[PDB]
Write an enzyme that holds these catalytic residues in place. Structure first.
Site: not given
Lengths: 245, 246
Positions: B9, B11, B93, B95, B163, B169, B209
């Site tokens: 991805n 992004k 996703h 995001e 995910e 983060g 990750s």
């Protein structure tokens, strides 16, 4: 103020059908007094720029507010420029009312697009409940304000008034209703920004426009052009280009 | 027999020149027949990327909408994605869900339409830190998978990507064993709620990750069938991840 005719293709077309439209557009005589811009679906920005004659500029339909980053599904003004497009549409009614884009986000997009060197077609407008409650001015002034506070330079902005209250509601706008809002918007720029900004900023009409209606709309003293929907996918767009002729 | 799957991805990163360099690296790379490799460029470059990438690498869109054409300024449809030569779309996703507020319902509708249009779907699920710390990992990922399941008539063109949003983060890390726990639970859900056939054949890929150093240990987990890679997908390190079973 140079007359401005934008075509918003929305989420329509494929390479074959868009390639055909582009042939029709490439055959258009663009008046010397008229600036023409087409906003393809994001997947075809590059395709469209390659195939369109440079007499027509290309716009993105939307973008995000940083140059690169962890934003799956977004494009940046940097990518837009990289594909040869020189404009982006921001704050479109569909972004606001289908996808929930806030005024603050839209303002931050506008500043970032302008800083990256794009022109911006910044869209505002009220819905039917807002209009019928008497708050047309409050709504469009606040949308314009939040944009204004997130920017400094007005030279590369075009304001697009969208009568969202006429979209699938059973109401439509007369040319006189469009003029009335455009005039109030120009008045807002004068009182909140400057006379110079008011006098030089194109305020284009983003409501229903056809080959039949474009000349009467274009003759309104504060209507400086169009952001066209459905007719932008047809030969009819070429006649709308000629609205001030 | 579940084919190992590595998605990259990209992004919202890159331009024609820099992505051209990346594509050159990927084209020169040895892709084992072992492995199904999929790259998801920024939407402005789906066409560009598909024209320059070798056919051993499939192209995905990073998102799409739920109808074939319409008044949806800024959106693209599965028909457009296919028209550009791409055969996958990433949906749900983290995001889209958490930065841009895409609901489970909308994601389910997109999955249905993308599948009906002939695309494969990388369908993403996962819990946030507050959900993880409230003990509701299962509830969250099972509900997300359920909504996706309600909008399915055929599962063969779907890949599920877990995910660990709690571990992206946040300062928190996820272990190989934590990833495996969620993956086996999801597969158990598929067995109980769909069919054993679906549970046995559906790739469940890890979207947390992953690097060149960690990919092999993650890939050895019995219910981890591959990766949906973020940052590292923009680097030659991606080739190490493609070869994580080698």
């Amino acid at each position: 103020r140079k007359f401005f005719v934008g075509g918003n293709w929305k989420m329509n077309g494929r390479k074959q059908s868009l390639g055909e439209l582009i042939g029709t557009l490439n055959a258009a005589k663009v008046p010397a007094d008229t600036e023409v811009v087409c906003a393809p679906p994001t997947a075809y920005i590059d395709f469209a720029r390659q195939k369109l004659d440079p007499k027509i500029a290309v716009a993105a339909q939307n973008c995000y507010k940083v140059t690169n980053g962890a934003f799956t599904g977004e494009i940046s003004p940097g990518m837009i420029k990289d594909c040869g497009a020189t404009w982006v549409v921001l704050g479109h009614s569909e972004r606001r009312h289908v996808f929930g884009e806030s005024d603050e986000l839209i303002g931050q997009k506008v500043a970032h697009a302008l800083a990256e060197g794009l022109g911006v077609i910044a869209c505002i407008g009220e819905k039917l409940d807002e209009r019928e409650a008497g708050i047309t001015e409050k709504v469009v002034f606040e949308q314009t304000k939040v944009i204004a506070d997130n920017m400094k330079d007005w030279s590369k902005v075009v304001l697009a008034y969208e009568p969202v209250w006429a979209i699938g509601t059973g109401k439509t706008a007369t040319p006189q209703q469009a003029q009335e809002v455009h005039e109030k918007l120009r008045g807002w720029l004068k009182s909140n920004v400057s006379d110079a900004v008011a006098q030089s900023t194109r305020i284009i009409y983003g409501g229903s426009v056809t080959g039949a209606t474009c000349k009467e709309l274009a003759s309104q003293p504060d209507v400086d052009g169009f952001l066209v929907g459905g007719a932008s996918l047809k030969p009819e767009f070429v006649d709308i280009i000629n609205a001030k002729q």
